[PDB]
Design a protein around this ligand. Structure first.
Ligand code: BQV
Length: 200
């Protein structure tokens, strides 16, 4: 069982800036969002199974999963939510575990945007939260996605509070400012995690 450090943070926390710094130190980074999207990408067996089970309306114009349609369809249908979890959870867990086993670094960085929201923190040895202000989240998302302020407000209202993230945090890193000093902060975390990984 390779030592797992979960990285989490809200929308617009600039998580890639922190993850890249660990990658630069030779840490294998395993991205939960990339894996989840991969499992249901066009041509993937789980996407075919979802379309067969729920219908062709689950497929968007570009061939990808219509995620809103699926959510609405399984919403308040517990049997179908249980079916969808029984399909996707083993597939995602198996790909995640495969990437962990293939990793060569002394510990891995598991990047999980919805770590708190989905109660997944118990799967990691250590939780690092990327801490940012709501203002920073709002600014970065609006510049990134070309979306309205009110649209980001709704996303923030639905995500975890900062106090909620810290409740499961072992480590916090402020990423409100410029990315310039992050590698220096991460260098210290990295040394600590090599120590923690060695005695785990
Ligand atoms: C929506 S998500 O993209 O935030 N992911 C998930 O819900 C999800 C579901 C099942 C499994 C895993 C990895 S469990 C693990 C396995 C080994 C080390 S850690 C994640």
């Amino acid at each position: 069982m390779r030592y797992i450090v979960a990285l989490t943070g809200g929308i617009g926390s600039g998580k890639s800036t922190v993850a890249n710094a660990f990658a630069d130190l030779g840490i294998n980074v395993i991205d939960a969002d990339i894996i989840a999207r991969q499992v249901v990408e066009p041509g993937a067996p789980a996407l075919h199974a979802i379309a067969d089970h729920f219908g062709a309306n689950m497929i968007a114009a570009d061939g990808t999963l219509q995620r809103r349609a699926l959510r609405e369809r399984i919403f308040a249908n517990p049997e179908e939510k249980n079916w969808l979890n029984a399909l996707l959870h083993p597939l995602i867990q198996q790909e995640t575990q495969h990437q962990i086993q293939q990793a060569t670094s002394p510990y891995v960085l598991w990047v999980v945007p919805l770590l708190v929201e989905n109660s997944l923190y118990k799967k990691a040895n250590r939780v690092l939260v990327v801490d940012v202000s709501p203002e920073t989240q709002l600014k970065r998302t609006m510049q990134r996605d070309d979306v309205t302020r009110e649209h980001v407000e709704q996303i923030l209202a639905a995500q975890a509070t900062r106090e909620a993230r810290l409740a499961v945090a072992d480590d916090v890193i402020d990423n409100n400012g410029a990315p310039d000093a992050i590698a220096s902060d991460v260098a210290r975390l990295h040394a600590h995690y090599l120590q923690l990984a060695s005695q785990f």
